[PDB]
């Protein structure tokens, strides 16, 4: 039973430092090759570095953009793998994996030093590098109208703007209204702040009678907001 | 990248598909393949010359020729809808390793559905905050791939735009959102603003005017 558990992820300012841990079990850790891999938000897997076993003298290789700032190490007696990061930059986000690394080499068609592949992975740990400070969201109404209405149904919602850090949870009418509701994934503005939207489609008939209130919760800033969404008055 | 992959590939449910990885290093090295789903740890699918890990279904298989490596899925299932990454050396004889950009595989199991689009103008509330955000909501479309373009009057709008990656709704159809950040001055200085959503070659457009 192979288990890999990464930890140590958290928020850190640009130019700051952070150390990630990875506890391993269920295989011969002493001779195992270990690799760190990171996946930036909305991007793919990127190879960070690898540390070998005793045969090659515990040698370490790093990806170019990371070298000189990152350091990989290990303590075999407690089965721990480390990634120590100095002078962190924003690009150094966001989700880091440790992986048991196997070695492959075909003697008849292959080329040295063969290939390294990744047999087992951990759940990962999230590293967030931003200068941004904790902020509560400003909530604005997305009011329904003729332009927002088609086929006997209307669309209304809330704009949860400029908050930090993730996440925000949104419900409608204290959870009572769940049908037709969709809360979008947050987007990350250049300012370093997050924004998202929560929409619910409802019968056009209901607009006159039914009341619609979105409940925004943001635990990182300890802020709760009950916001009513009604059709705008043209006057 | 050093290893190039298709940005996205689609396949009918229960059919065969092949995604590729090309790079000069592959001429001398073998590639490994990985499946990745959101919020889940990657899985090694295939490696070496002809190596498949036990537990991985046999519909997965790898091949190679020249500077290219290929991953083939014979009989695509619904669960196979995921991200796929190839990995190998960055150069020939290198001790370093590298991943391709990755390919988003879409498994088509439902009828095409036209996107329902709603464009919200900046609320009077927000404008008082000296801010202005155009919100373009897109919903009930299939498959989950859209292109959003904004227009100020008739001219394209470059900056201020933020768009999310499409996500599943309750009814397994996809939804996406796009934001245009304007200053109240910019907002009031144009005759109209338009949100153009392109889905499966067809384009739907919603417009709002500041005179409201």
Residue numbers in the entry:
A (entry chain A): 1 to 52, 52A, 52B, 52C, 53 to 82, 82A, 82B, 82C, ...
B (entry chain B): 2 to 9, 11 to 95, 95A, 95B, 95C, 96 to 211
From the primary publication:
One such antibody, the 10E8 antibody from donor N152, is perhaps the broadest of all HIV-1 antibodies thus far identified. The 10E8 antibody recognizes an epitope in the membrane-proximal external region (MPER) of the HIV-1 gp41 transmembrane glycoprotein. Like other MPER-directed antibodies, the 10E8 antibody is able to recognize its gp41 epitope in the membrane context, a trait that it appears to acquire during maturation, as this trait is not present in V gene-reverted germline versions of these antibodies. Here we combined an additional round of NGS from the same January 2011 time point with structure-function studies of germline and mature 10E8 antibodies and of their maturation intermediates to approximate the developmental pathway for the 10E8 lineage.
